[PDB]
Amino acid sequence: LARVAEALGSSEQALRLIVSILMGYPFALFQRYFLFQKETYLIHLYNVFTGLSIAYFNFGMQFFHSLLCVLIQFLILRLMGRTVTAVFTTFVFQMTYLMAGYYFTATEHYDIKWTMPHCVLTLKLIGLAIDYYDGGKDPELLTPEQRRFAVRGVPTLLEVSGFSYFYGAFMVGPQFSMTDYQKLAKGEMTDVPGQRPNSFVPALKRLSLGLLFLVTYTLSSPYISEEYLISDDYMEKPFWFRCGYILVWGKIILYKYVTCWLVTEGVCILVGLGYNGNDQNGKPVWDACANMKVWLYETTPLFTGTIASFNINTNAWVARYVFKRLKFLGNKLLSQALALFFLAIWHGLHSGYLVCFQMELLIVIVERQVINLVRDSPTLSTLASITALQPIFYVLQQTNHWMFMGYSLVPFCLFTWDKWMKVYKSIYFLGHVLFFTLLLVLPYIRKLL
Amino acid sequence: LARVAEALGSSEQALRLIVSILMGYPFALFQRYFLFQKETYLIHLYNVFTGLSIAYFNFGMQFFHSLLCVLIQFLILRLMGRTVTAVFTTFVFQMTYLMAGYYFTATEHYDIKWTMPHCVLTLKLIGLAIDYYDGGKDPELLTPEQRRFAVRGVPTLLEVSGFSYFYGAFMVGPQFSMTDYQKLAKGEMTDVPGQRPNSFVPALKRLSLGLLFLVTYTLSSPYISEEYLISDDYMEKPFWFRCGYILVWGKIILYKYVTCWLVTEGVCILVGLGYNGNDQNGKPVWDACANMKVWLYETTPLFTGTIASFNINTNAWVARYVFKRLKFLGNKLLSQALALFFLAIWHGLHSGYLVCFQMELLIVIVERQVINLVRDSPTLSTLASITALQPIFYVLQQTNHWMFMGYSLVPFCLFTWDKWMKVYKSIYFLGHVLFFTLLLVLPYIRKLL
Ligand SMILES: CCCCCCCCCCCC(=O)OC[C@@H](O)COP(=O)(O)OCC[N+](C)(C)C
Ligand SMILES: CCCCCCCCCCCC(=O)OC[C@@H](O)COP(=O)(O)OCC[N+](C)(C)C
């Protein structure tokens, strides 16, 4: 409806996405109470129907495209099951399908179109194929976590269709594995063997936090937007103020993402999929499929402290299915680039993503070098601080972290060859030149000390 | 000059290219008579100067890009000389440079721009890198051709610069190897151990034939052009006539290529680079760096007989450095489906090339299947012919060959999504559907017989 779209002050696409995400709670409540007896095919059909309904509500003309990619893989997965070339052909097919979709969409403004659910689906399917090939090997140890994380059996059409179309983690949801989905289907993922998983208390906290972030972001949205950055006229304000804007911006655009992940956690933890075990005391731990770690993402002066708390899940998937599969190159420095290149193509086909990831690589390397210089061969360095007082150091580090994360996040939201450089040149290319000088000078001063 | 361009009836680019190609003959005549004493650096400097002048007279200010590829490789070739990763990095760098040039250069007409000399240069440099890598291995009993080609030593800047900028084979010239260039530089490519090689008699034939083809093509150029097909008002004559046009066309557009190769052969055979050995009788053989074999390209009813008579210096290079190097994977078909893909990218970035190469692959497979069915399992099918009277079969086969080679060469000269399909749909997609039906039916009828 256009009336509600104009009333809420945002485009109808975002409202439709939010209502689709929020519609998962009644589905989970219905599932948790009417499926005590298993009869797994009921769960599989229910998941398929709910996922198809969710896809039809939003993308109600092109959803059958997804129904293609599930079926074709099932053929490729069936024949040449354990050969190496199956992995190659499925990887190439999925990549070329995604690239064709991206090329034929190629919209300039940020739009929530057909692309993202298919992106999540195709990455999950590649993961499933890799896992099946890995589990097809000999039953020896092979890094026992890898052994227990593999799949053994025949993945018939019903199981793969149900696992592909989970209603909760479909749009932007967390990426689970194949082995644990069958555990949920077979009902061995509960707090105790013979009762419903008691998870009401964890879910409300996540829902409250996600709603709080959502409401504060939508309240603070009109004040700051990615149009003041150029405006063709306001590129004359005092330099410091401009930097201050980049400090206020970036920290606000991130809250657009966070909330949805948090809220989808609420629909993913209620069904019991977020169980991993108990702690030393024995109490249950529900932080298994979490996509965000609040209270560490905020207060983290280190540049590397925002890489293990922001995305966490996709990063873990990339590390597990790229680094562990390219141990025969042996360079140890090429792979860390190649993975990023893959992460620079999975997001999109524009140019801003490459520059953003290059800046992230440069900043993390510089931070590693600086933290290696101190506290390892400090001499005067540590006893100069002597831990007498570090309020000023902490606040300066925090401001530096915010400013130089927003400064590299600018090309993420503006991914055109013209607007990016037009808004980026007014800052005198500060970050790249400064960090290049630091990188080229630091070994010399380290050798001096 | 525009006056000569309008007088000759062709654009100034073609005339400039032809005059540049023809300008090599005084260079070769000067070289053959004033360089009895070797002092190799004189030859290297002469080659560099002549190649740079030729590049200047065609592409005035842009030629430095070519230099920007010769020097960088010399660095990559110097450090990490014998490692595996050197091949990977030089391959990726050359491919991405060529792709960037093509993407920034792409136009909708056939333009003689910066691309082609850089394309030849980059493919030659990739070949040099592969050959140098295959020279640092153990000197065991490899394949004799590998030992005959492998280079041992360190290529300094002068030698690589001279070998890269050969004046004769620069624009569209044949692609020789690295080891034999040093043989020419050291003066051992002669009929008699020491004297000027006797090559006047072989050379004049390649001028007579080349000039004959050139004059016939330029005389018959105005009658047939690639505009009558797409005029959209000439698509209404009866069906057969249209097919007849495709028979007359295609066989004419090919003569645009042939001549130049022939003529550059004349400037490549005079210097003595076309020597390979003697025959059984003992007379010299000069068909070493030939790029086309006339008297077999014309009268060849077989569809596979036009692959060993067209350009046999790029096909041989591809087979030597891709087809017979990816034997570790061991599929025997995927490689045949991979190398062509490389050949589908080296030509350009448009879409017509892929379809043309796919059609060539399909027709050659169909021809192989048909020739396998006959003369191997006749079953009273050919024992009755006994060569009684079959000129009709020969002429029918020749007409079929011409028609279905032109029908697949059409997308080569028209490489846009719109023009190609508009000109191709009026023929009712005859070749693809016919060959698909033949491919799907032939095994069944073979099993029947
Ligand atoms: C209150 C309004 C709610 C707004 C809805 C936005 C949902 C966040 C998208 C998360 C998708 C994802 O997992 O990729 C994470 C990153 O990749 C971010 O992705 P992008 O923001 O660049 O979107 C284009 C790239 N896709 C297509 C691959 C998703
Ligand atoms: C009387 C007038 C003379 C006309 C001059 C034309 C010269 C023939 C080009 C041969 C280049 C080559 O070796 O590639 C052979 C094929 O690749 C053909 O190539 P194309 O015709 O498609 O040209 C674009 C592709 N390049 C850029 C790679 C060369």
Side-chain angles (χ1 to χ4, degrees), chain A residues 72-89:
Chain A
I72 295 298
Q73 179 82 16
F74 184 42
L75 300 202
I76 297 169
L77 189 45
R78 184 45 76 78
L79 321 183
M80 71 225 78
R82 299 317 211 286
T83 187
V84 189
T85 58
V87 161
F88 187 84
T89 187

PDB file of all heavy atoms in Angstrom, chain A residues 72-89:
ATOM      1  N   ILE A  72      18.533 -27.762 -10.505  1.00  0.00           N
ATOM      2  CA  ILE A  72      19.690 -28.060 -11.345  1.00  0.00           C
ATOM      3  C   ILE A  72      20.818 -28.647 -10.508  1.00  0.00           C
ATOM      4  O   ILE A  72      21.419 -29.667 -10.867  1.00  0.00           O
ATOM      5  CB  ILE A  72      20.146 -26.800 -12.100  1.00  0.00           C
ATOM      6  CG1 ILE A  72      19.059 -26.347 -13.076  1.00  0.00           C
ATOM      7  CG2 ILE A  72      21.450 -27.060 -12.833  1.00  0.00           C
ATOM      8  CD1 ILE A  72      18.743 -27.365 -14.148  1.00  0.00           C
ATOM      9  N   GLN A  73      21.102 -28.022  -9.362  1.00  0.00           N
ATOM     10  CA  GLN A  73      22.126 -28.551  -8.468  1.00  0.00           C
ATOM     11  C   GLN A  73      21.823 -29.990  -8.081  1.00  0.00           C
ATOM     12  O   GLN A  73      22.729 -30.832  -8.042  1.00  0.00           O
ATOM     13  CB  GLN A  73      22.240 -27.675  -7.221  1.00  0.00           C
ATOM     14  CG  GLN A  73      23.277 -28.161  -6.226  1.00  0.00           C
ATOM     15  CD  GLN A  73      24.679 -27.732  -6.595  1.00  0.00           C
ATOM     16  OE1 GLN A  73      24.868 -26.836  -7.418  1.00  0.00           O
ATOM     17  NE2 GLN A  73      25.673 -28.370  -5.991  1.00  0.00           N
ATOM     18  N   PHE A  74      20.548 -30.301  -7.826  1.00  0.00           N
ATOM     19  CA  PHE A  74      20.184 -31.664  -7.454  1.00  0.00           C
ATOM     20  C   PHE A  74      20.597 -32.656  -8.532  1.00  0.00           C
ATOM     21  O   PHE A  74      20.982 -33.790  -8.226  1.00  0.00           O
ATOM     22  CB  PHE A  74      18.683 -31.759  -7.188  1.00  0.00           C
ATOM     23  CG  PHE A  74      18.243 -33.112  -6.714  1.00  0.00           C
ATOM     24  CD1 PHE A  74      18.988 -33.806  -5.778  1.00  0.00           C
ATOM     25  CD2 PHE A  74      17.091 -33.694  -7.213  1.00  0.00           C
ATOM     26  CE1 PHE A  74      18.589 -35.052  -5.341  1.00  0.00           C
ATOM     27  CE2 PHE A  74      16.688 -34.942  -6.778  1.00  0.00           C
ATOM     28  CZ  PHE A  74      17.438 -35.622  -5.842  1.00  0.00           C
ATOM     29  N   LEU A  75      20.519 -32.252  -9.802  1.00  0.00           N
ATOM     30  CA  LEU A  75      21.057 -33.097 -10.861  1.00  0.00           C
ATOM     31  C   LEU A  75      22.573 -33.192 -10.757  1.00  0.00           C
ATOM     32  O   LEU A  75      23.136 -34.292 -10.722  1.00  0.00           O
ATOM     33  CB  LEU A  75      20.639 -32.559 -12.231  1.00  0.00           C
ATOM     34  CG  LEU A  75      19.140 -32.471 -12.527  1.00  0.00           C
ATOM     35  CD1 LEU A  75      18.901 -32.449 -14.027  1.00  0.00           C
ATOM     36  CD2 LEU A  75      18.388 -33.628 -11.886  1.00  0.00           C
ATOM     37  N   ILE A  76      23.247 -32.043 -10.661  1.00  0.00           N
ATOM     38  CA  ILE A  76      24.705 -32.036 -10.591  1.00  0.00           C
ATOM     39  C   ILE A  76      25.173 -32.757  -9.336  1.00  0.00           C
ATOM     40  O   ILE A  76      26.206 -33.436  -9.337  1.00  0.00           O
ATOM     41  CB  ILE A  76      25.235 -30.592 -10.652  1.00  0.00           C
ATOM     42  CG1 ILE A  76      24.865 -29.947 -11.987  1.00  0.00           C
ATOM     43  CG2 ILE A  76      26.742 -30.560 -10.462  1.00  0.00           C
ATOM     44  CD1 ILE A  76      25.119 -28.457 -12.035  1.00  0.00           C
ATOM     45  N   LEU A  77      24.415 -32.626  -8.248  1.00  0.00           N
ATOM     46  CA  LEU A  77      24.759 -33.332  -7.022  1.00  0.00           C
ATOM     47  C   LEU A  77      24.532 -34.833  -7.159  1.00  0.00           C
ATOM     48  O   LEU A  77      25.238 -35.623  -6.522  1.00  0.00           O
ATOM     49  CB  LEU A  77      23.946 -32.774  -5.854  1.00  0.00           C
ATOM     50  CG  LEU A  77      24.330 -33.258  -4.459  1.00  0.00           C
ATOM     51  CD1 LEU A  77      25.836 -33.211  -4.312  1.00  0.00           C
ATOM     52  CD2 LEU A  77      23.656 -32.415  -3.392  1.00  0.00           C
ATOM     53  N   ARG A  78      23.563 -35.247  -7.979  1.00  0.00           N
ATOM     54  CA  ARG A  78      23.247 -36.669  -8.076  1.00  0.00           C
ATOM     55  C   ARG A  78      24.307 -37.417  -8.876  1.00  0.00           C
ATOM     56  O   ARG A  78      24.940 -38.351  -8.368  1.00  0.00           O
ATOM     57  CB  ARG A  78      21.864 -36.862  -8.696  1.00  0.00           C
ATOM     58  CG  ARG A  78      21.401 -38.311  -8.741  1.00  0.00           C
ATOM     59  CD  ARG A  78      21.677 -39.024  -7.426  1.00  0.00           C
ATOM     60  NE  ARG A  78      20.736 -38.640  -6.380  1.00  0.00           N
ATOM     61  CZ  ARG A  78      19.498 -39.103  -6.279  1.00  0.00           C
ATOM     62  NH1 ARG A  78      19.013 -39.974  -7.149  1.00  0.00           N
ATOM     63  NH2 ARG A  78      18.728 -38.683  -5.281  1.00  0.00           N
ATOM     64  N   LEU A  79      24.513 -37.026 -10.127  1.00  0.00           N
ATOM     65  CA  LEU A  79      25.527 -37.645 -10.963  1.00  0.00           C
ATOM     66  C   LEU A  79      26.905 -37.101 -10.599  1.00  0.00           C
ATOM     67  O   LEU A  79      27.033 -36.027 -10.008  1.00  0.00           O
ATOM     68  CB  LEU A  79      25.232 -37.400 -12.444  1.00  0.00           C
ATOM     69  CG  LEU A  79      23.772 -37.451 -12.898  1.00  0.00           C
ATOM     70  CD1 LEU A  79      23.679 -37.258 -14.401  1.00  0.00           C
ATOM     71  CD2 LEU A  79      23.120 -38.762 -12.490  1.00  0.00           C
ATOM     72  N   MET A  80      27.936 -37.862 -10.967  1.00  0.00           N
ATOM     73  CA  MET A  80      29.331 -37.576 -10.617  1.00  0.00           C
ATOM     74  C   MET A  80      29.457 -37.111  -9.161  1.00  0.00           C
ATOM     75  O   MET A  80      30.051 -36.080  -8.846  1.00  0.00           O
ATOM     76  CB  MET A  80      29.962 -36.578 -11.604  1.00  0.00           C
ATOM     77  CG  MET A  80      29.498 -35.115 -11.552  1.00  0.00           C
ATOM     78  SD  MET A  80      29.168 -34.379 -13.167  1.00  0.00           S
ATOM     79  CE  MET A  80      27.570 -35.070 -13.560  1.00  0.00           C
ATOM     80  N   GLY A  81      28.904 -37.925  -8.258  1.00  0.00           N
ATOM     81  CA  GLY A  81      28.718 -37.480  -6.884  1.00  0.00           C
ATOM     82  C   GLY A  81      30.012 -37.171  -6.151  1.00  0.00           C
ATOM     83  O   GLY A  81      30.129 -36.132  -5.498  1.00  0.00           O
ATOM     84  N   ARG A  82      30.998 -38.063  -6.242  1.00  0.00           N
ATOM     85  CA  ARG A  82      32.207 -37.951  -5.434  1.00  0.00           C
ATOM     86  C   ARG A  82      33.428 -37.497  -6.225  1.00  0.00           C
ATOM     87  O   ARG A  82      34.536 -37.491  -5.678  1.00  0.00           O
ATOM     88  CB  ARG A  82      32.507 -39.282  -4.741  1.00  0.00           C
ATOM     89  CG  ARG A  82      31.418 -39.763  -3.797  1.00  0.00           C
ATOM     90  CD  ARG A  82      30.871 -38.627  -2.947  1.00  0.00           C
ATOM     91  NE  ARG A  82      30.419 -39.088  -1.639  1.00  0.00           N
ATOM     92  CZ  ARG A  82      29.310 -39.781  -1.423  1.00  0.00           C
ATOM     93  NH1 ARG A  82      28.501 -40.122  -2.414  1.00  0.00           N
ATOM     94  NH2 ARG A  82      29.002 -40.141  -0.181  1.00  0.00           N
ATOM     95  N   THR A  83      33.265 -37.123  -7.488  1.00  0.00           N
ATOM     96  CA  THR A  83      34.398 -36.671  -8.281  1.00  0.00           C
ATOM     97  C   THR A  83      34.749 -35.225  -7.945  1.00  0.00           C
ATOM     98  O   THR A  83      33.924 -34.455  -7.445  1.00  0.00           O
ATOM     99  CB  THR A  83      34.110 -36.797  -9.775  1.00  0.00           C
ATOM    100  OG1 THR A  83      35.303 -36.508 -10.515  1.00  0.00           O
ATOM    101  CG2 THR A  83      33.035 -35.817 -10.182  1.00  0.00           C
ATOM    102  N   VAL A  84      36.003 -34.866  -8.220  1.00  0.00           N
ATOM    103  CA  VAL A  84      36.454 -33.500  -7.979  1.00  0.00           C
ATOM    104  C   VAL A  84      35.767 -32.532  -8.935  1.00  0.00           C
ATOM    105  O   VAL A  84      35.443 -31.398  -8.563  1.00  0.00           O
ATOM    106  CB  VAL A  84      37.986 -33.418  -8.095  1.00  0.00           C
ATOM    107  CG1 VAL A  84      38.482 -32.061  -7.624  1.00  0.00           C
ATOM    108  CG2 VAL A  84      38.641 -34.540  -7.306  1.00  0.00           C
ATOM    109  N   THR A  85      35.533 -32.960 -10.178  1.00  0.00           N
ATOM    110  CA  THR A  85      34.981 -32.068 -11.191  1.00  0.00           C
ATOM    111  C   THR A  85      33.565 -31.604 -10.870  1.00  0.00           C
ATOM    112  O   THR A  85      33.127 -30.584 -11.411  1.00  0.00           O
ATOM    113  CB  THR A  85      35.002 -32.746 -12.562  1.00  0.00           C
ATOM    114  OG1 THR A  85      34.250 -33.964 -12.509  1.00  0.00           O
ATOM    115  CG2 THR A  85      36.433 -33.055 -12.976  1.00  0.00           C
ATOM    116  N   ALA A  86      32.837 -32.328 -10.017  1.00  0.00           N
ATOM    117  CA  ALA A  86      31.509 -31.875  -9.613  1.00  0.00           C
ATOM    118  C   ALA A  86      31.592 -30.546  -8.872  1.00  0.00           C
ATOM    119  O   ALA A  86      30.788 -29.635  -9.107  1.00  0.00           O
ATOM    120  CB  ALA A  86      30.832 -32.933  -8.744  1.00  0.00           C
ATOM    121  N   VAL A  87      32.571 -30.418  -7.974  1.00  0.00           N
ATOM    122  CA  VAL A  87      32.781 -29.158  -7.268  1.00  0.00           C
ATOM    123  C   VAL A  87      33.083 -28.041  -8.255  1.00  0.00           C
ATOM    124  O   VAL A  87      32.519 -26.943  -8.166  1.00  0.00           O
ATOM    125  CB  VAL A  87      33.907 -29.314  -6.229  1.00  0.00           C
ATOM    126  CG1 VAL A  87      34.462 -27.957  -5.837  1.00  0.00           C
ATOM    127  CG2 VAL A  87      33.398 -30.060  -5.007  1.00  0.00           C
ATOM    128  N   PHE A  88      33.968 -28.306  -9.217  1.00  0.00           N
ATOM    129  CA  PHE A  88      34.325 -27.288 -10.199  1.00  0.00           C
ATOM    130  C   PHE A  88      33.108 -26.843 -10.999  1.00  0.00           C
ATOM    131  O   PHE A  88      32.868 -25.641 -11.169  1.00  0.00           O
ATOM    132  CB  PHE A  88      35.415 -27.823 -11.128  1.00  0.00           C
ATOM    133  CG  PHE A  88      35.965 -26.795 -12.073  1.00  0.00           C
ATOM    134  CD1 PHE A  88      36.969 -25.931 -11.671  1.00  0.00           C
ATOM    135  CD2 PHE A  88      35.480 -26.695 -13.366  1.00  0.00           C
ATOM    136  CE1 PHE A  88      37.477 -24.985 -12.539  1.00  0.00           C
ATOM    137  CE2 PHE A  88      35.984 -25.751 -14.239  1.00  0.00           C
ATOM    138  CZ  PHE A  88      36.983 -24.895 -13.825  1.00  0.00           C
ATOM    139  N   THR A  89      32.320 -27.801 -11.493  1.00  0.00           N
ATOM    140  CA  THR A  89      31.199 -27.437 -12.351  1.00  0.00           C
ATOM    141  C   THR A  89      30.110 -26.711 -11.567  1.00  0.00           C
ATOM    142  O   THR A  89      29.534 -25.738 -12.069  1.00  0.00           O
ATOM    143  CB  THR A  89      30.644 -28.672 -13.075  1.00  0.00           C
ATOM    144  OG1 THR A  89      29.660 -28.261 -14.034  1.00  0.00           O
ATOM    145  CG2 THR A  89      30.019 -29.666 -12.113  1.00  0.00           C
TER     146      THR A  89
END
